[PDB]
Design an enzyme around this catalytic site. Structure first.
Site, PDB file in Angstrom:
ATOM      1  N   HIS A 134       5.972   0.966   5.221  1.00 28.88           N
ATOM      2  CA  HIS A 134       4.767   1.831   5.276  1.00 28.88           C
ATOM      3  C   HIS A 134       3.490   1.078   5.645  1.00 28.88           C
ATOM      4  O   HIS A 134       2.530   1.716   5.734  1.00 28.88           O
ATOM      5  CB  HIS A 134       4.586   2.692   4.024  1.00 28.88           C
TER       6      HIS A 134
ATOM      7  N   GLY B 207       0.435  -5.602  -9.767  1.00 25.40           N
ATOM      8  CA  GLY B 207       0.985  -5.823  -8.446  1.00 25.40           C
ATOM      9  C   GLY B 207       0.776  -4.633  -7.530  1.00 25.40           C
ATOM     10  O   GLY B 207       0.753  -3.474  -7.959  1.00 25.40           O
TER      11      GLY B 207
ATOM     12  N   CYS C 278       1.741  -3.145  -3.275  1.00 27.74           N
ATOM     13  CA  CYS C 278       2.924  -2.938  -2.449  1.00 27.74           C
ATOM     14  C   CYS C 278       3.474  -4.263  -1.934  1.00 27.74           C
ATOM     15  O   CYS C 278       2.723  -5.140  -1.500  1.00 27.74           O
ATOM     16  CB  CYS C 278       2.576  -2.011  -1.284  1.00 27.74           C
TER      17      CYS C 278
END
Ligand SMILES: CC(C)NC(=O)Nc1ccccc1
Lengths: 301, 304
Positions: free
Chosen positions: A41, A143, A145
């Site tokens: 993505h 965190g 991606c």
């Protein structure tokens, strides 16, 4: 004595984290051998991220689209391809810090460590379990991606998870390192919510076995239940049903403590119906469900 | 919001993993910390089982030569060219500087402050966890066997601040240790004589920072319209074994108070009611427990 949850030492994984940029989007990548792994993505704009054709959008990117940076050194993309939801960027340089590694797929209830990263830089590490609804608890500050989950066995890193997105409910969702999502999720800007989570019953039992190994024994009773009857009471309390597989996994702990699994299931059924009535187990007033049977076997044997 | 479902994290441990070595004297084996050409480890590595009740470390150390100490980094034997004692920390000079030495400092921490521990066995990193120095100067550590010499640390801008080294397990299940200059935290000694940790208390300033974080992230069920005096709060708090709050800690929460519009003593009144009623399945930031191992320092930086 003393049962602290622990994450694996993250050094072997730290030496593989890089920063990947496509256009304006920037996220983390996993540099192993001469390939960088990252969520697919990253090649999406705001126009695309509603129903995108990833394989069609991907072929129409060259190699120089991709900005791969490892510290201050920019790695040189010489090819790209897609495998389900992970983008694979072959670069000209093999990572000399590449550890012994494997790609594995885990099951809900199994535990692993996450190395939270931002812009390729490792920020922190934590231990977690894959929830029964295939989400991982964690905030935007746990965190972004491309951060990965992993176990370490012997000197070999087993990569099992890559973070793809943060759901609004304080949990994130992602894939294995072959791009297969965990759970009914899609890498798209669409209305997506996590199903109702449940408690990982086999892990609670592993944790009660750990309490017995540390001499916390007040909750043990003389009774046994059936797997059928225990499950009936468990689901009413949003606990996961226990399978005969789960019973077998708990075998070694039953042999090492003398408490049969359905004996321990009677104590846990009693805990669910009456609480702890102002007591604690292993110092906690709450039942822990992010310790697998093997986590206990490692730490307590 | 930003911290919906926040999990505590340890720092990435790789920089410390590169410094861990195995130190052996006679039949005692434990972990050492290899920084530049010095290996730091607990001084009781030089003890026998019979020495442990009342070791005379100065006497035991002067009878040791450099070849009494076996230091091993992986498969490489480091050769000890010198040894000295600094308080309870033994310092072994070796002939090889650690090429993996990160930028590092030695710092002493106060109770309530947080750090990560790299639990190690036989010089080998086994696991990492995040914890606070408890008000009774102990830390709640892993099951253990021979994790002595495991260090606790913070990382800030690729500089590793070493603040703890594990020395002993108290009979309670908790652990005691020193700073990296050999001074114990609390009133403990490196002897096997009867030692007991004082009654532990909740770190109130860390709880209030946590509740503030929940307010920045829109989790507001626990707020009440009340305020309290600092000394009325401390009267109630200490009866729930909560640590007393000082003007210092009031000031420390100041930035969070300004960012939310909620005065510190307003939040204290909310905490007082939480202790009265209890969290009984209800969650804050996704956690069913009042968290006291996240400091105001971390909250302000993560909620700018
Ligand atoms: C309690 C929930 C958040 N899980 C963790 O905390 N895992 C973890 C493990 C090691 C160090 C720090 C955290």
């Amino acid at each position: 004595s003393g049962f602290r949850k622990m994450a694996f030492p993250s050094g072997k994984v730290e030496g593989c984290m890089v920063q990947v940029t496509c256009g304006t989007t920037t996220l983390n990548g996993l540099w192993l051998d001469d390939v960088v792994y990252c969520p697919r993505h990253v090649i999406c704009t705001s126009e695309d991220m509603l129903n995108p054709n990833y394989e069609d959008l991907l072929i129409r990117k060259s190699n120089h689209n991709f900005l791969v940076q490892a510290g201050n050194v920019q790695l040189r993309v010489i090819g790209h391809s897609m495998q389900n939801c992970v983008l694979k960027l072959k670069v000209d340089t093999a990572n000399p810090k590449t550890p012994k590694y494997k790609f594995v797929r885990i099951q809900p209830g199994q535990t692993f460590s996450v190395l939270a990263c931002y812009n390729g830089s490792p920020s922190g590490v934590y231990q977690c379990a894959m929830r029964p609804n295939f989400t991982i608890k964690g905030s935007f500050l746990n965190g972004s991606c491309g951060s990965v989950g992993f176990n370490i066995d012997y000197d070999c890193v087993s990569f099992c998870y890559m973070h793809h997105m943060e759901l609004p409910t304080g949990v994130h969702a992602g894939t294995d390192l072959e791009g297969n999502f965990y759970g009914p999720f899609v890498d798209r800007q669409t209305a997506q919510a996590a199903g109702t989570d449940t408690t990982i019953t086999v892990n609670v039992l592993a944790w009660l076995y750990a309490a017995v190994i540390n001499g916390d024994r007040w909750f043990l009773n003389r009774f046994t239940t059936t797997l059928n009857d225990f499950n009936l009471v468990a689901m009413k309390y949003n606990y996961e049903p226990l399978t005969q597989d789960h019973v077998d996994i708990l075998g070694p702990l039953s042999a090492q403590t003398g408490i049969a699994v359905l004996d321990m299931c009677a104590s846990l059924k009693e805990l669910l119906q009456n609480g702890m009535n102002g007591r604690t187990i292993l110092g906690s007033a709450l039942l822990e469900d992010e310790f697998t049977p093997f986590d206990v076997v490692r730490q307590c044997s």
